[PDB]
């Protein structure tokens, strides 16, 4: 009592001030750019949209009892906003309810009252044209609730709030949508609600209702509005199609919807990974290991987001199976030190000839390997065991014999020599010619990359690239 | 005092790690145990050693007596504040922190060394104090915190010499350099062995030359390293003294391909018995092998390993699997042959290479402008 | 020792001389410009980071 009593004057007021004012400015400028700013497709409250991405995940989770955030919802949701007098009245209420939080007791809203709080926006000449404003007003019912990470008996109330918000999709698709371009904001809202509603269906069974509804909400894309909704809903579509053990993947390849364009270096980067594992499940053959490296190098700016460890883990797994033999200690993050040990032993016995050591490690750490979702690694890794050795010696000796190259790679028999001399030609793992009159696999080499038109091949795309950059500058300059 | 204080940290840093090899290390480590009044380091070696003749009672009275000989003035001095003058007198820790390191542990040494470092604002004292922090950084092998005071010396402490970093600018090749770094301070940082020997701890005239000779031959192959290893005069005298150093060099330059393994095996025997354990060698032994493979493979595109069976050494199969180890590891650029017994080589052209690099840099910077393109403008 | 532009053949007992083409200059001077372009993109980098 004397210890815990003196320690709650300061905790409440911080969210009471900044958690108060942040979305106040957000809804403010965002509203002014909803009425004005006919080109509000790129709002600076979209960077405030990102600021809300990392804003509530760390700022506030509970409603901050001792009357800090509990009174926010009864204030912020009581928004009638009829005209300038009845809106300057609410402008008064922004400060007027502050005496209610500070002096009085706030309105307790433990994720049960926000649903009945959805009448304050209807009271006193409700506003429906501000479906962005009431849309963030539909995110806020989740914002303390879902971000509290409960998944306990209010998952269903999550679902009901998101049913009202899907009714806000109904309002956009049906109610006063005169080219207001709000779906592309409602597609981000659909994103946020369906990350933690994705988790909601992780804490419960399958999502097939959101599969058909996802094919509908995605169906409306490409016809009237298409920007990041097809992207995000496509990724949510892919994640649990992959998560479930079924065919599930050639349906994705035939899912010819792959080009929702530039995703601001965030959605597109992971997008290459969602598609990347997809191309990986069909025995990827250096075509999508390049896009694995691409995705890993596109948006790494975070700090171990949690799936980034899985892209960093699974990336060179396929390359090991294909041609390469690098380890994965290069980015030995503290975030990686505990996610490296099984894979650490994993890549050693591949290049080393101790396949019994490889089976020892595989039986040793297969549980982690099976937790990684890479069951099919062993069924095709013995492939690149002898292919890795033969790639090594094939690189080493230029005019190597096949009648000698076998006997060094623990082949032990001339018949065993040429079981690898039947597909290496068609594969291209080594460039040589095999003969029976001379059973010697002699390779060769060529030049004229500088004497054949290699450079002007490599240059054209990047020339277009730089002119692209110039076009972006000229298009994104003269705002003032 | 602290000037011969080197050897204790070195032999203690050499003793316990070699388990099979510690007999002489204890035979003289006892000489470093009670003798020299040595108190601080070995008590922390209580669980680090297995046997120890009784030195608790024989020596704790010795650190206690001298500790009583220093702490009585180091904390209350009041020697020159009886008539008038400034409010202090500089006689306390500048004259009594040295025992606070030699017998005072690293803590009582550090608190007084910094306290006098701030007490006397002069680079004159900032010389000896900070360099005691460095030699103690070698003492307790705490080679991370004393990585700080070095650059901290470089910022303000260092300004070009001034009898304080020029006379001791050889506080900067042996004192604080690669114990385990093994990077571009080997060929470049370890070249200007200017003085015959600089005094505090770096022994050019005896064994720093062993450092800079074990490290000289890493810089270049033949853009005239022979002028500074072979035409060098002061190095010519030290090589005149040490034949193993002299033969190992004169082996290397004078196409001594068969004895490269002999002298090389000698110096690797040296690396066996050393203080640098983890950096036993990253690139010494067979980076000198492959170093002999640059000049050996040089100009001999139509080379045969049969000639390798006597010219550079023997064991055609061992040279075989070695070149397999090197060509397959992106090193030793050439194409070696099966039964023909031919050692072929082929480097790129004047355009294949630069194309191969420009394609790299263009991809790097293009990826950069990718991210920075979308950082702004939403 | 670069006193000579030739090549020796152990399996041939043959020396062969060639000519020295110095045509690496443009590719040489191209890369260092990239070396500056990296750091200048840094200069814009901490610019946009310091303020959008």
């Amino acid at each position: 009592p004397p210890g815990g009593g003196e320690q709650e004057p300061p905790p409440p007021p911080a969210p009471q001030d900044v958690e108060m004012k942040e979305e106040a400015a957000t809804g403010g400028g965002s509203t002014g750019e909803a009425d004005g700013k006919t080109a509000a497709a790129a709002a600076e409250h979209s960077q405030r949209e990102l600021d809300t991405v990392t804003l509530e995940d760390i700022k506030e989770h509970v409603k901050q009892l001792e009357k800090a955030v509990s009174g926010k919802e009864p204030r912020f949701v009581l928004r009638a906003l009829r005209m300038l007098p009845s809106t300057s009245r609410r402008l008064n209420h922004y400060v007027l309810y502050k005496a209610v939080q500070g002096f009085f007791t706030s309105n307790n809203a433990t994720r049960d009252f926000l649903l009945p709080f959805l009448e304050e926006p209807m009271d006193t000449e409700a506003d429906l044209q501000f479906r962005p404003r009431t849309g963030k007003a539909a995110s806020t019912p989740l914002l303390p609730e879902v971000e509290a990470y409960l998944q306990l008996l209010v998952v269903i109330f999550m679902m009901n709030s998101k049913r009202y918000k899907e009714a806000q999709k109904i309002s956009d698709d049906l109610m006063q949508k005169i080219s207001t371009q709000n779906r592309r904001a409602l597609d981000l809202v659909a994103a946020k609600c369906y990350y933690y509603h994705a988790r909601v269906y992780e804490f419960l069974d399958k999502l097939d209702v959101v599969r058909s509804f996802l094919h509908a909400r995605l169906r409306t894309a490409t016809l009237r509005h298409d920007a990041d909704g097809q992207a995000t809903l496509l990724n949510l579509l892919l994640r649990n199609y992959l998560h479930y053990s079924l065919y599930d993947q050639a349906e994705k390849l035939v899912s010819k919807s792959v080009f929702p364009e530039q995703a601001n270096n965030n959605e597109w980067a992971r997008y290459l990974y969602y598609t990347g594992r997809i191309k990986a499940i069909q025995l990827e053959y250096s075509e999508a290991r390049r896009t694995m490296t691409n995705a890993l190098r596109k948006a790494p700016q975070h700090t171990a987001v949690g799936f980034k460890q899985t892209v960093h883990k699974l990336l060179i797994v396929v390359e090991l199976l294909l041609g390469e033999i690098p380890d994965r200690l290069q980015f030995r993050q503290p975030s990686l030190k505990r996610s490296l040990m099984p894979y650490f032993l994993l890549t050693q016995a591949v290049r080393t000839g101790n396949l019994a050591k490889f089976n020892q490690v595989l039986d040793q750490f297969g549980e982690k390997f099976q937790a990684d979702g890479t069951y099919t690694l062993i069924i095709r890794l013995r492939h690149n065991v002898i292919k890795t050795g033969v790639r090594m010696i094939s690189l080493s000796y230029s005019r190597i014999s096949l009648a000698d190259i076998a006997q060094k790679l623990q082949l032990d028999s001339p018949e065993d020599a040429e079981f690898i001399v039947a597909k290496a030609i068609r594969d291209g793992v080594i460039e040589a010619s095999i003969n029976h009159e001379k059973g010697y696999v002699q390779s060769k080499e060529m030049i004229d990359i500088y004497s054949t038109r290699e450079p002007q091949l490599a240059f054209h795309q990047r020339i277009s690239f730089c002119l692209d950059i110039h076009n972006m500058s000229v298009k994104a300059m003269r705002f003032p | 005092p602290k000037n011969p204080d080197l050897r204790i940290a070195q032999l203690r840093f050499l003793l316990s790690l070699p388990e099979h090899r510690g007999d002489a290390a204890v035979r003289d480590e006892l000489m470093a145990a009670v003798r020299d009044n040595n108190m601080a380091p070995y008590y922390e070696a209580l669980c680090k050693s297995l046997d120890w003749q009784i030195d608790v009672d024989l020596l704790n009275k010795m650190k206690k007596a001298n500790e009583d000989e220093l702490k009585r003035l180091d904390e209350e001095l009041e020697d020159a504040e009886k008539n008038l003058g400034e409010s202090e007198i500089r006689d306390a820790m500048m004259a009594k922190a040295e025992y606070l390191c030699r017998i005072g542990d690293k803590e009582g040494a550090l608190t007084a060394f910094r306290k006098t470092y701030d007490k006397t604002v002069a680079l004159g004292h900032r010389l000896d104090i900070v360099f005691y922090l460095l030699r103690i950084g070698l003492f307790y092998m705490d080679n991370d915190l004393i990585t700080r005071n070095t650059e901290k010396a470089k910022s303000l402490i260092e300004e070009g010499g001034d009898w304080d970093r020029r006379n001791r600018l050889k506080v900067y090749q042996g004192l604080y350099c690669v114990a385990i770094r093994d990077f571009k301070q080997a060929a470049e940082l370890f070249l200007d062995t200017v003085s015959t020997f600089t005094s505090y701890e770096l022994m050019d005239y005896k064994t720093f030359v062993t450092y800079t000779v074990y490290v000289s031959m890493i810089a270049l192959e033949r853009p005239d390293l022979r002028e500074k290893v072979i035409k060098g005069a002061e190095i010519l005298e030290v090589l005149h003294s040490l034949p193993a150093v002299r033969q190992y060099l004169f082996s290397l330059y004078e196409c001594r391909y068969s004895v490269f393994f002999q002298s090389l095996a000698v110096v690797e025997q040296e690396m066996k018995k050393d203080w640098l354990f983890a950096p036993h060698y990253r690139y010494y032994v067979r980076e000198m092998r492959i170093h002999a493979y640059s000049q050996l493979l040089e100009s001999y595109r139509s080379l045969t390993l049969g000639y390798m069976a006597e010219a550079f050494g023997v064991g055609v199969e061992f040279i075989d699997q070695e070149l397999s180890r090197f060509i397959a590891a992106g090193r030793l650029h050439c194409k070696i042959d099966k039964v023909n017994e031919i050692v072929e080589t082929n480097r790129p052209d004047s355009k294949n290479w630069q194309y191969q690099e420009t394609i790299k840099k263009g991809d790097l910077l293009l990826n950069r402008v990718q991210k920075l393109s979308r950082v702004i403008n939403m | 020792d670069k006193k000579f532009h030739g090549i020796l053949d152990q399996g041939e007992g043959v020396l062969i001389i060639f000519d020295e083409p110095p045509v690496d200059k443009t590719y040489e001077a191209a890369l260092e410009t990239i070396q500056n372009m990296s750091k200048v993109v840094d200069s814009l980098y901490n610019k946009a980071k310091k303020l959008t």
């Binding site: - | 263009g362 702004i376 | 191209a30 372009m37 200048v40 959008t52």
Partner: peptide, 30 residues
């Protein structure tokens, strides 16, 4: 290729240059 390379970056400077002045003068204007 190199010329286009530097030209793109030079064009990219003005994006930061004007995107700074626009919003910084706006937020101070309001």
């Amino acid at each position: 290729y190199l010329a286009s390379l530097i030209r793109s970056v030079v064009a990219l400077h003005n994006l930061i240059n004007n995107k700074i002045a626009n919003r910084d003068a706006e937020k101070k204007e309001g």
